Design a binder for this molecule. Sequence first.
Ligand SMILES: O=C(O)[C@@]1(O)C[C@@H](O)[C@@H](O)[C@@H]([C@H](O)CO)O1
Ligand SMILES: O=C(O)[C@@]1(O)C[C@@H](O)[C@@H](O)[C@@H]([C@H](O)CO)O1
Ligand SMILES: O=C(O)[C@@]1(O)C[C@@H](O)[C@@H](O)[C@@H]([C@H](O)CO)O1
Ligand SMILES: O=C(O)[C@@]1(O)C[C@@H](O)[C@@H](O)[C@@H]([C@H](O)CO)O1
Lengths: 179, 179, 179, 179
Amino acid sequence: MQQKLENIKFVITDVDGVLTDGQLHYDANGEAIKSFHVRDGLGIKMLMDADIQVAVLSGRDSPILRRRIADLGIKLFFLGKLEKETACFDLMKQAGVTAEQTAYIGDDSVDLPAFAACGTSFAVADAPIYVKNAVDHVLSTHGGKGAFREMSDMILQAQGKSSVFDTAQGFLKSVKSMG
Amino acid sequence: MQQKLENIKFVITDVDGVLTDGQLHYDANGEAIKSFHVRDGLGIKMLMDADIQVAVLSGRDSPILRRRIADLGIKLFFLGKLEKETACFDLMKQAGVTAEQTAYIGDDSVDLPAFAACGTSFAVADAPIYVKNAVDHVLSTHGGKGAFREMSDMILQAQGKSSVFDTAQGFLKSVKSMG
Amino acid sequence: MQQKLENIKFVITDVDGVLTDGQLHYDANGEAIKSFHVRDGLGIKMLMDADIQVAVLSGRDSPILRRRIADLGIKLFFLGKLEKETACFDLMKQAGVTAEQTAYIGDDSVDLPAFAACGTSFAVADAPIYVKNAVDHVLSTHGGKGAFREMSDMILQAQGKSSVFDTAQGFLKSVKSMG
Amino acid sequence: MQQKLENIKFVITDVDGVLTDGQLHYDANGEAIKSFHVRDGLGIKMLMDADIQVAVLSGRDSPILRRRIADLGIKLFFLGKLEKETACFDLMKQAGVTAEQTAYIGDDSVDLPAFAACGTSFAVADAPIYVKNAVDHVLSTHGGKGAFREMSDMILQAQGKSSVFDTAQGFLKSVKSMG
Ligand SMILES: O=C(O)[C@@]1(O)C[C@@H](O)[C@@H](O)[C@@H]([C@H](O)CO)O1
Ligand SMILES: O=C(O)[C@@]1(O)C[C@@H](O)[C@@H](O)[C@@H]([C@H](O)CO)O1
Ligand SMILES: O=C(O)[C@@]1(O)C[C@@H](O)[C@@H](O)[C@@H]([C@H](O)CO)O1
Ligand SMILES: O=C(O)[C@@]1(O)C[C@@H](O)[C@@H](O)[C@@H]([C@H](O)CO)O1
């Protein structure tokens, strides 16, 4: 993984079952709550601060997700988008990066075309076998439990930028970019 | 399981403890949130697209559940229905299928008559022993964690229709029927 | 456990960490959602139908809990009550039963006086060691995951009344008392 | 741990991933629900009653968190505070205690400066390796599942004050200070 992890400048993430644990919390009007993970959020800020852009690609759209996106300072994203191959290529163009500079993390069949578009692919731990087979690296953490952060930790460390998370002094240098 | 799985044209599912993990999220006015699983939802759409109808049978009713049902394009259902044997037979009549073409997935005693009505029965992994004893197949996944999708995956693969989930090209052929 | 389980006519249950998993879901105004378990609810109805009364004893009170209590047909209860010894004795008096006819299920220190008041005591699986030490029986299921139902199943079976849950015909005889 | 645990007079806790399991439950307007743990709450009251002050230190702020803080009788706290070293020292000054009388419990990189400021540090069980490496003691319980209570139990027992939790009589002596 080292040689691909080293050249990542852009990360695209699916939401449901990656940034969340797959649960859709309905009320009478549809999605009412989305549950994201706090250590994921910090990982997102760490990547951005380390000159790695972050994008969101989801087959669902909601004002809730759009709010979490704003909270995190995420700029590039396509929502309600079920055909994800063309979506990935469009996001890379906006990011000013190539496919081999791009990493994608997913959990289900809808992500299979995204895995094909991006140079590096990750699956969350609770992903089905046919998804795990299609990615470069299967993560040890379940979706919505820090799976993104585990990935972001890997990418940063590969590029020698682990101080932001493994030392008090490293964190307290990018602290203005953390929230 | 192959010979029964091959002839399934209709799936009836219980909600609480199957499509959910059994939790009822109350507020002051009763049920306030229901949590469904995203990979279950995709499995539901995949079955329908593969000419397998899907129905919901629940001993509880709520505007929340009725919304999730609408979101998924599910047509046939009986809610607030605790006597489930007659309910299953009525649903099969509406579906235009027979009992041996019908599969049911449940988690508790209330589902025991449904298991008797349908030709093929599944239990979620966290079902009690007396429920596991009564079904044809006990699933490895807990309710609300993809138990339905595990079943739907099994049914499709038995009928040679796994491409919709295990290949990017298969998924990107039924993509208009996925949401 | 058989000889005590056989003579139980009354069950008193704690809420947080027994009927729930211990989580308190706050909004700005305090408790906003309480999550109960569906298989617990059915167990509650089964006990009542088998001439075993059910009571709730909680150190917290909320309109949410009061709603779930009404939904279940539970009549006897004391809420916001942190001194639970006197509370248990008062509930037994209302139930028309004795201490050796009474079972209590708890998860934390506040339940320790309740264990002392009632003849039979249960601890949920995730209870601390000092709680497990104080009860007659430690359950295998975690609080809010069917711990009550596991107990209710035990009590009924001890008294020869397991048909209501382990047979379709048994369930479909008390079906009007199930919801 | 005994010699440090014995002289603790002040505990500072992080919220997300310690008092909660790391999940941020968004609606359209941001954080909509925070989930705390009931056995944690009792541990908080037990510490305070045993002349150990409790403080909250979080990089996030919300009316929800401020409500839970009020519910628990917690007085000292700094919210929305991402640089936590100076924050810890300020809290100790308000508490009238020293650094070697102070214990901190965290789960992520943002807590690394807090670990350095306080004499005794704890990590929740699901904390990353670089956090576990930085603390005096790694807890066996996951964040939001009683990790705080496990710590509070340890501190009290070290100081000979375990009766409040391991005996009915001990609990029923500080019962007015428990809620
Ligand atoms: O919202 C989050 O997920 C995030 O990780 C984001 C960060 O901005 C950071 O604020 C962290 C906490 O505030 C750190 O204690 O929350
Ligand atoms: O709501 C869902 O559960 C579902 O699985 C349904 C599908 O329509 C699909 O939209 C999927 C996601 O949108 C795929 O990324 O959500
Ligand atoms: O609300 C429940 O927990 C309960 O178990 C109660 C029962 O009344 C019953 O209705 C069951 C479901 O309705 C059975 O499918 O819900
Ligand atoms: O809100 C809680 O977490 C707390 O633990 C706090 C305590 O005040 C106590 O009231 C307990 C329950 O009320 C005990 O049954 O709740």
